[PDB]
Specification:
Shape: elongated
Radius of gyration: 13 Å
Oligomer: part of a larger assembly
Entry title: Mycoplasma pneumoniae 50S subunit of ribosomes in chloramphenicol-treated cells
PDB class: ribosome
Structural class: mainly alpha
Keywords: In-cell cryo-electron tomography chloramphenicol-treated sub-tomogram analysis, ribosome
Order of helices and strands: HHH
Name: 50S ribosomal protein L29
Organism: Mycoplasma pneumoniae (strain ATCC 29342 / M129)
RNA sequence: AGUUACUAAGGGCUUAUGGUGGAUGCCUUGGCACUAAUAGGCGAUGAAGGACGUGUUAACCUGCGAUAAGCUUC
């Protein structure tokens, strides 16, 4: 699931993806602060996602 | 007038038990001293050592560094 990210617009689409991931990660963590986050597993994945893109 | 078993508040001796206490005996992911090979350094591309932080997981230990108990590639 990385060669499927090299092929994307490795110059510009990835920037939009990065900002979207940061936003939804922030909203995930905020949901975790209160209640109503019923899939606590999404945080570890989404951070794991950015680690590839920046790479 | 006289003789002498019983007393045991408590103690003593042996023998049996019970409690504390952790020596002797068996053992060990630990240490010690050595051999034979390898290698004899790290660092402005910012080290050694430290702080601080990071979790679906409280603290601590460990790993790791805002890509943060993990990322890419063979």
């Amino acid at each position: 699931t990385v060669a499927k990210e090299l092929r994307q617009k490795s110059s510009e689409e990835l920037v939009k993806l990065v900002i979207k991931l940061k936003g939804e990660l922030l909203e995930y963590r905020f949901k975790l602060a209160h209640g109503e986050l019923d899939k606590p597993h999404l945080i570890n994945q989404t951070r794991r996602l950015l680690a590839t893109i920046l790479t």
